[PDB]
Amino acid sequence: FTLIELLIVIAIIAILAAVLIPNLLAARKRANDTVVTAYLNDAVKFQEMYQIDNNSYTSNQAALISLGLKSTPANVTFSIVSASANSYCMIAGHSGGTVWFAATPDKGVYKTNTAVTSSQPESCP
Amino acid sequence: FTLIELLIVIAIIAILAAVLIPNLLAARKRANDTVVTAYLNDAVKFQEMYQIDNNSYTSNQAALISLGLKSTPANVTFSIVSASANSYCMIAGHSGGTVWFAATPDKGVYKTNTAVTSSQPESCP
Amino acid sequence: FTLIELLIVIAIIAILAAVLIPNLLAARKRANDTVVTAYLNDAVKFQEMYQIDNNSYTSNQAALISLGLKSTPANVTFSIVSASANSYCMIAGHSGGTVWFAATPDKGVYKTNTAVTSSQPESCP
Amino acid sequence: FTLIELLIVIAIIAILAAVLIPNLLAARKRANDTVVTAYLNDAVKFQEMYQIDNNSYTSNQAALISLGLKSTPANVTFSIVSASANSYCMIAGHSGGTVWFAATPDKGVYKTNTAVTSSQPESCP
Amino acid sequence: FTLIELLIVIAIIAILAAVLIPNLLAARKRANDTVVTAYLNDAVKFQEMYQIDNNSYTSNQAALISLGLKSTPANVTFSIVSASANSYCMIAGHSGGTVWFAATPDKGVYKTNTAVTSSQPESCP
Amino acid sequence: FTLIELLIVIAIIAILAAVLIPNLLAARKRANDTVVTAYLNDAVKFQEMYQIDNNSYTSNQAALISLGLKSTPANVTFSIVSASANSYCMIAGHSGGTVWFAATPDKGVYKTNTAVTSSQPESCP
Amino acid sequence: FTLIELLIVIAIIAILAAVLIPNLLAARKRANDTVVTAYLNDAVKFQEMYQIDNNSYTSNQAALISLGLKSTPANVTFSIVSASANSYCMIAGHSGGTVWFAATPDKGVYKTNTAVTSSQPESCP
Amino acid sequence: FTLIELLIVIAIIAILAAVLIPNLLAARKRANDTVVTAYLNDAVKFQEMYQIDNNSYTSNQAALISLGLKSTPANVTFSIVSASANSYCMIAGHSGGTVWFAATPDKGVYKTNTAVTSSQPESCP
Amino acid sequence: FTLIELLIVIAIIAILAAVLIPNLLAARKRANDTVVTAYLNDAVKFQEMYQIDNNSYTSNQAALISLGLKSTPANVTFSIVSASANSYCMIAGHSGGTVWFAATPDKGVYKTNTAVTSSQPESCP
Amino acid sequence: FTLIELLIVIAIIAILAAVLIPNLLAARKRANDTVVTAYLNDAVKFQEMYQIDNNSYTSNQAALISLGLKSTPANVTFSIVSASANSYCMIAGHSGGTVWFAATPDKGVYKTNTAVTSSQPESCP
Amino acid sequence: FTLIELLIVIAIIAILAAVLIPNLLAARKRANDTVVTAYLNDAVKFQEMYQIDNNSYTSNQAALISLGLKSTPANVTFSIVSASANSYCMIAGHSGGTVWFAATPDKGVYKTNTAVTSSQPESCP
Amino acid sequence: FTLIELLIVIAIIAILAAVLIPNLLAARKRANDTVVTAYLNDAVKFQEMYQIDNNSYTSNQAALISLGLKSTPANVTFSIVSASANSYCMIAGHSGGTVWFAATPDKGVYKTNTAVTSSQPESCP
Amino acid sequence: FTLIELLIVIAIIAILAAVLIPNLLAARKRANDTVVTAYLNDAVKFQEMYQIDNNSYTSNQAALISLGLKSTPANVTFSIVSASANSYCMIAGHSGGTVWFAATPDKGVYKTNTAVTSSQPESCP
Amino acid sequence: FTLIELLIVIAIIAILAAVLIPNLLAARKRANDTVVTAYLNDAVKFQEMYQIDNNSYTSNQAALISLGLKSTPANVTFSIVSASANSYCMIAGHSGGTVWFAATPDKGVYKTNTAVTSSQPESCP
Amino acid sequence: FTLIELLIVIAIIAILAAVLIPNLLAARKRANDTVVTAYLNDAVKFQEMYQIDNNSYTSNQAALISLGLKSTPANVTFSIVSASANSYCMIAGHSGGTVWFAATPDKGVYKTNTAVTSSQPESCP
Amino acid sequence: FTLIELLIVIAIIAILAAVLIPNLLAARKRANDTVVTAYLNDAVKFQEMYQIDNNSYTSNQAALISLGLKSTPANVTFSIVSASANSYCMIAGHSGGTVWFAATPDKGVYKTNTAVTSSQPESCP
C-alpha cells in the first residue's frame, strides 16, 4: 500500500464528488411548478363546487378553503385576481419556481411569460 | 428509482394537466342557455294559464309568479317587453350565456342575434 | 357519464324546445272566431224572441240582454248597426280574431272581408 | 306532444264549454207558452162542442174533459173564471212561462200583461 | 377523463334537474277544472233528459245516475243545491282545483269567485 | 323536454279521454224516440187520408204505404193493433229506445209505461 | 394526474350509471296504455260512422277498417266481443301494458281490473 | 339528465304523434254530407215558396236563389234534374263526401247508392 | 409517484376515452326525425286552417306560411306533392335522418320505407 | 448514482404524494347529492304514475316500489312526510352529502338549508 | 465516494422498487368494469332505437350493430339472454373483471353476485 | 480506502447508469397519444357546439377555435378532412407518436393502422 | 519505501475512513417514511375500491388485503382508527422512521407532529 | 535505514493488503440484483404498453423488445412463464446473483426463495 | 551495521519501488469514463427540461447550459449530433478515456465501439 | 571490518535519509481537502433533509447537526453564508489545506480561487 496509490485514490474522489452530484436547484424548480399546477388544478375544482352552491365564483380564498380546498402551500403565493358571476382569474407561483401560473375557466391552468423573480401579474393573459 | 425517471414523470404531468382539463367557460354557456330556454318555456305556460283566468296577457312578472311560476333564476335577466290582450313579448338572457332569447306566442321561444354582453333588446324580432 | 354525452343532450333539448312548441297565436284566432260566431248565433235567437214579444227588432243591446242573452264576451266588440221592424244587421268581432262577422236574418251569421285590425264595418254586406 | 300543446287545448275547451252551451231557461219559456196556447186553443174548441149539446158554456173543467179535452198539462194552472150562456173567460199559464194567457170568444186566445211569477188574473182583459 | 370534467358534469345535472322539471301542481289544477266542467256539462244534459220524462228537475243525484250519468268523479264534490219545476242550481268542484263551478239553465256551466280551499257555495250566483 | 313532462301529459290524456267522451247510448235513445214519434205522427196523417177515400181506418200497413207513407224505419217495430170504422190503435217502438209509443185519434200520439226491452203492448191505454 | 384521481372518477361513473338511468319498462307501460286508449277512442268514432250508414254496430273489425279506421297497432290485441243494433262491447289491450281496456257506448272507453298478463275478458263490466 | 332518458322521450313522442292524430278525411266526409243535406233541405223549402207564387216547381236554380236561397256551397254540385207542375227531382253531392243525395217531395231528402267519385245520377230513385 | 403508475393511468384514459364517448350520429338521427314529424304535424294543422278559409288544400308552401306556419327547418326538404279540394299529400325528410315522412289526412303523419339517402318519394303510400 | 441523487428523489416523492392526491371527501359529497336528486326525481315520476291509477299520492314507500321504483339507495334516508289527494312532500338526503333535498309537485326537487349532519326536516319549505 | 455509500443506495432502490410500484391487476379490474358497464349502457340505447323501428327488442346482436352500436369489446363476452316484445335481458362481463353485469329495462344496468371466473348467468336477477 | 475499493465502485456506477435509466422515447409516445386523443375529444365537443348554432359541421379549424377550442398543440398536425351537414371526419396525430387518430360522430375518436412516420390518411376508416 | 511513508498512509486511511462513511441511520429514516407514505397511498386506493363494492369504508385490514392490498410491511405498524360510511382515519408509521403518518379522505396522506418513538396517535388531526 | 525498518514495513504491507481489500463477490451480488430488478421493472412497463395496443399480455420476449424494451442483459436469464389476456408471470435472475426475481401485475416485482444456483422456478409464487 | 546489510536493503527498495507502484494510466481511464457518463447523464436530464419548456430538443449546447447544466468538463469533447422535435443524439468522450459514449432517449447513455484515439462518431448506433 | 567500510555506510545512510523521506506537508493538504469536500458533501445532504421537514434551508449549523450531521471537523472552519427558502451558500476550508470550498445547490460542492492562508470568502462564486 503505497502513498501514490493513496494519492491517486484521493484525486479520483475529488473528480467523482464534482461530477456525480446533480444539479439540485434545477431539479426542485420543476417539482415546485408541479405544486403550483396541482394547487391551481385543485383551486379550479373548488371554484366549480362554489358555482354549484352560490351560482358565482369566489374573490376570497377563505370561501374555497371552507368548501374543502387545502391551505396555501409552503413558499407559494396564491392570489385570486378577480371573479365575476360567470368567470375567474387566479394567478399563483412558487418563490423558487420557473414562472407564474394563471388559471381561468376557458384556458384552464396554464403558465405565463412572467418570471417568479419578477413581480406578480396584475391580470392573466 | 432515478432522478431522470422522476423528472420525465414531472414533465408528463405538466402535459396531461394542460390537455385533459376541458374548456369550462364554453361548457357552462350552453347550460346557461338551457336555463333561459326552460324559464321562457315555463313563462309561456303560465302566460296561457293567466289567459284562461283573465282573458289577457301579463305585463308584470308578479302575476305569473302568483299563478305558480318560479322566481327569476340566478344570473338571469327576465323582462316582459309588452303584453296586449291577444299577444306578448318576453326577452330573457343569462349574464354568461350566448345570446338573448325572445318568447312570443306565434314564433314560440327562440334566440335572437343580440349578444348577452350587449344591451337588452327593446322588442323581439 | 361524459361531458360530450351531456353536451349533445343539451343540444337536442334546444332543438326539441323549438319544434315541438306549437303556434299559439294562430290556434287562439280560430277559437276567438268561435266565440264571435257563437255570440252572434245566440244574438240571432234573442232577436227572434224579441220579435215574438214586441213585433220588431232591437237597436239596443240591453233589450236582448233583458230577455236572456249573456253580456258581451271578453275582448269582443258587439255592435248592432240597425234594426227595422222586419230586418236587422249586427256586426261583431274579436280583437285577436281573423275578421269581422256580420249577422242578418236572410244571410244568417257570416264572415266579411274586413280585418279585425282594420276599423268596424259601417253596414253588413 | 308538449305540455303547452295540452295546456292550450285545456284552455280552449273552457272557452268552448262556456260560449257554445245555449240559454236553456229562455228556450223552454217559449215552448211552455206554446203548451198554454195549445191547451187554451183546444179548450176553446170543446167549449163550442158543449155549446152544441147544452146551449151554454162550462164553468167546471170536468165537463170539457168528458167531451174529449185532455187533462191539464204538467206545470200548468188552467182555471175557468166564468161562463155565462153566451160568453166565457178562461185564464191559463205555465209556472216557468212568460205571462198568463186569457181565452174569450170575441178576442180568441191572447196573452195578458200579468207575469207568471205574479198571481193569477181575476178576470180577463 | 379528469375529475374536473366529471365534477362539472355533476354541476350541470343539478342545474338541469331543477329547471327542466315543470310545475306539476299547477298543471293538474287546470286538468281538474276540465273534469268538473265536463261532469257539470254532462249533469246539465241528464237534467234535460229527466225534464223530458218527469216534466221537472232532480234534487237528488241518484235520479240523474239512473238515467245514464256516471258516478261522481274521484276527488270531486258534486252537490245539487235546489231544483224547482222550471229551474236548477248545481255546484261542483275538485279538491285540488282552482274554484267552484256552478251550473244553471240560463247561465249554463260557469265558474264562481269562491275558492276550492274555502267552503262550498250555498247558492249559485 | 323531460320524461316527467311527458309522463304528466300521458296522465292528463287518460283523464281527458274518460271525462270528455259523452254518454252515447243515452243520447241515441231520445233520438230513437223522435223516429218512433215522427213515424206515428206520419202514420196518423195517412190514416186520415185513407178515411177520406174509404170512410174507414186501415188494419194492414200496406194500405197506408200505398197512399204515400214510408216503409217501416230501421230497428223499429210498427204494428197496428186494430182499426174499426171510426177508431184505431197503433203501437210502435224502437229496439234501443225508452218505451213503446201508442197512437189513437182521441189521445193522439203518446208514450206508455211499457219498456222496449219488455214485450209489445196488446192494446193501447 | 394520479391513479387515485382516476380511480375515484371510475367509482363515480359506476354510481352515476346506476342512478341516472330511469325505469324504462314502467315508462313504456303508460305510453302503451295511451295507444290502447287512442285506438279504442278511434274505434268508438268509426262505430258511430257505421251506425249512420247501416243503422247498427259492427261485430267484425274489417267493417270499421273499410270506413277509415287504421289497422290494429303493433303488440295490441283488439277484439270486439259483441255488437247488437243499439249497443257494443270492445275489449283491447297491449301485451306490455297495465290492464285491459273496455269500450261501450254508455260508459265510454274505460279500464278494467283484469291484467294484460292474465287472459282476455269475455265481456266488458 | 341522461341520453337514454332523452332517447326514450323521443321514442314516445313518435308513438303519441301517430296514434293521437285522428282520421281527418273521414271526419270531413260526414260534415260534407251535412252541408249537402242542409242545402237540399233549404232547397225543398224555397221550392214550396215558389209553388205558393207561381203554382209550379222550378227547373232553374236562379229562380230559387231570387226568392231567398243561398248560392251553391263550396265544392258542391247542386243540379235540378226536372220539375213538373206537381213534382220535382233535385240531385246534389259534395266532391269529398260519401254519396249523392236526392230530393223529391214524396220521399223528402234522402241518400242514394251512387258514390261521389262516380258520375251524377240522371234521375232520382 | 412512479413511471409505471403514470403509464397505467395513460393506458386507462385511452380505454375510457373510447368506450364512454357515445354514438353521436345515431343519437341525432332520431332527433332529426322528431323535427320532421313535428313540422309535418304543424303542416297538417295549417292545412286545416286553410280549409276553414278557402274550402280547399294548399299546393304551395307560401300559403301555409302566410297563415302562421314557420319557415322550413335547417337541413329539411319539405315538399307538398299534391292538394285537391278534399285531400293532400306532403312528403318531408331530414338530410341526416332515417327515412322520409309522408302526411295525408286519412293516415295522418307516418314514415315510409324510402331512405333519406335515396331520392324523394313521388307520391305518398 | 449518488446518495444525494437518491435523497432528493425521496424528497420530491414526499412533495408529489401530498399535492397530487385530490380531496376525496369533497368529491364524493357532490356525487352523493346526485344520487339523492336522482332518487327524488325518480320518486316524483312514480308518484305521478300512482296518481294515474288511484287518483291520489302515496304516504308509504312500498306503494311507489310496487309500481316500479327501486329500493332506497345505500346510505340514503328517504322519507315521505305527507301526501294528500292533490299534493305531496318528500324529504331525502345522503349521510355524507351536503344538505337535505325536498320534493313537492309545485316546486319540484330542490335543496333546503338544513344540513345532513343535523336532523331530518319535519316539513319541506 | 465509498462502497458503503453505494451499497446503501442499492439497498434503498430495492425498497423503493417494491413499495412504489402499485397493484396493476386490481387497477385494471375496475377499468374493465367501466368497459362492460359502458357497452351495456350503449346496448340499452340501441335496444330502445330498435323498439322505435320494429316495436320489439332484439335477440341477436347483429341487429343492434346494424343500427349503430359498436362491435363487442376486446376480452368481453356480450350475450343477450332473451328479448320479448316488451322486455329484454342482456348479460355481459370482462374476462379479467370483477363480476357479470346484467341489463334489463326495469332495473337498468346492474351487477350480479356471479363472478367472472365462474360461468355465465343463464338469466338476469 | 484502497484503489480496488474505488475501482469496483466505478464499475458498479457504470452498471447502474445503464440499467436504471428508463426508455424515454417510448414513454413520451404514449403521452403524445394522450395529447392527440384529448385534442380530438375536445374537437368533437366544439363540433357539437357549432351544430347547435349553425346546424352543420365545420370544414375550417378557425370556426371551432372561435367558439372556444384551443390552438393546435405543439408538434401536432390537426386537419379536418370533410364536414357535411350531418357528419364529419377529423384526422390528427403527433410527430413522435404511435399512429394517426381519426374522429367521426358514429365511431367517436379512434386510432387507425397508419403510422405517424407515414403520410396523413386521406379519409378516416 | 520508508516506515514514515507507510506511517502517514496509515494516518490518512484513519481520516478517510471517518469522513467518507456517510450517516446511515439518517438516510434510512427518509426511505422508511417513503414506505409508510407509499403503503398509506396504496391503502387509500383500496379503501375507494371497497367503497365501490360495499358503499362504506373498512374498519378491518383483512378486507383491504382481500381486494388486492399487500400485507403490512416489515417494521411498520399500520392501524385503521375508525371508518364510518362516508369517512376514514388510518394511522401508520415505521419503527425507525421520523413521525407517524395519518390518512383521511379530505386531507389525504399527511404527517403528524407525534414521533415514532412516542406512542401511536389515538385519532388523526 | 536498517534492514529491520525495511522488514517491519514488509510485514505491515502484508497485513494492510489482506484487511483493506474488500469482499468483491458479495458487493457484485447486490449490484446484479439491481440489474435483474431494473430489467423486470422495465419489462412490467412494456407489458402495459402492449396491453394498450393489443389488449393482452405477451408470451414471447421479441414482442416486448419491438415496442422499446432493451435486449436481455449480460449473464441474465429472463424468461416469461405465461401471459393470459388479463395477467402475466415473468421469472428472471442473474447467474452470480442472490435469488430469482418474479414479476406479476398484482404483486409487482418481488424476490422468491429459490436460489440462482438452483434451477429456474416453473411458476411465480 | 555492515555494507552488505545496507546493500541488500538498497536491493529490496528497488524491488518494492517497481511492484508496489500501481498502473496509474489505466486507473484514470475508468474515472474519465465516469466523468463522460455523468455529464451525458446530466445532459439527458436538461434535454428533458428543455422538452418541458419548448416542446423540442436542443441542437446547441448553450441552450442546455442556460437551463442549469454545467460547462463542458476538462479534456472532454461534448458534441450534440442532431436533435429533432421528438429525438436526440449526443456523442461525448474523454481524451484519455476508453471509448466514445452516445446518448439517445430510447437507448439511454451507452458506450460505442469507436475508440477515443480514433475520430468522433458522426452518428450514434 | 574496516573504518572506511563503516564510513561509507554512514555516508549512504545520510543520502537515503534525505531522499526516501517523502513530502509530508503536501501529502496532508490533499487529505485535508477530502475532509472539507466530504463534510460539505454531507452538509448538502442534511440541507435537503431539512428542506423535506421545514420547506427551507438552514442559516444556522445547529439545525443541520440536530437532524444527523456530525460536529465540525478538527482544524476546519465551516460557515454557512446565507440560506433563503430555495437556495443556500456554504463556505468551508481546512487550516492547512489548499483553497476554500463552496457549496451551492446549482453548482454542487466546488473549490474557489481564494487560498486558506487568505481570509474567508464573503459569498460563493
Author numbering:
A (entry chain L), B (entry chain A), C (entry chain E), D (entry chain B), E (entry chain F), F (entry chain C), ...: 1 to 125
Manuscript text:
Type IV pili (T4P) are flexible extracellular protein filaments found on many bacteria. They form multifunctional fibres involved in twitching motility, adhesion, immune evasion, bacteriophage infection, virulence and colony formation. Pilins have a conserved N-terminal α-helix, with a 4–5 stranded antiparallel β-sheet at the C-terminus. The α-helix forms the core of the filament, while the globular β-sheet head domain is solvent exposed and subject to post-translational modification.
Our data unambiguously demonstrate that the wider pilus is composed of the major pilin PilA4. The diameter of the wide pilus is 70 Å and is roughly cylindrical. The region between the N-terminal α-helix and the C-terminal β-sheet, the so-called glycosylation loop, ranges in PilA4 from amino acids 55–77, with a two-turn α-helix comprising amino acids 61–67. The C-terminal region is an antiparallel four-stranded β-sheet with the last strand facing towards the N-terminus followed by a loop that ends on the β-sheet. A disulphide bond between Cys89, which is located in the second strand, and the penultimate amino acid Cys124, likely stabilises the C-terminus. PilA4 has no net charge but the filament displays a distinctive positively charged groove along the filament axis. In the wide (PilA4) filament, each subunit (subunit A) interacts with the N-termini that project down from the next two subunits above (B and C) and from the subunits which are six and seven subunits above (G and H). PilA4 contains two intermolecular salt bridges—between Asp53 (subunit A) and Arg30 (subunit D), and between Glu48 (subunit A) and Arg28 (subunit E). The surface of our wide PilA4 filaments show a striking line of positively charged residues along the long axis, into which a double stranded DNA molecule can be fitted. In summary, we conclude that PilA4 has three known roles: it promotes pilus formation for both wide and narrow filaments, it comprises the main structure of the wide T4P, and it plays a role in natural transformation.
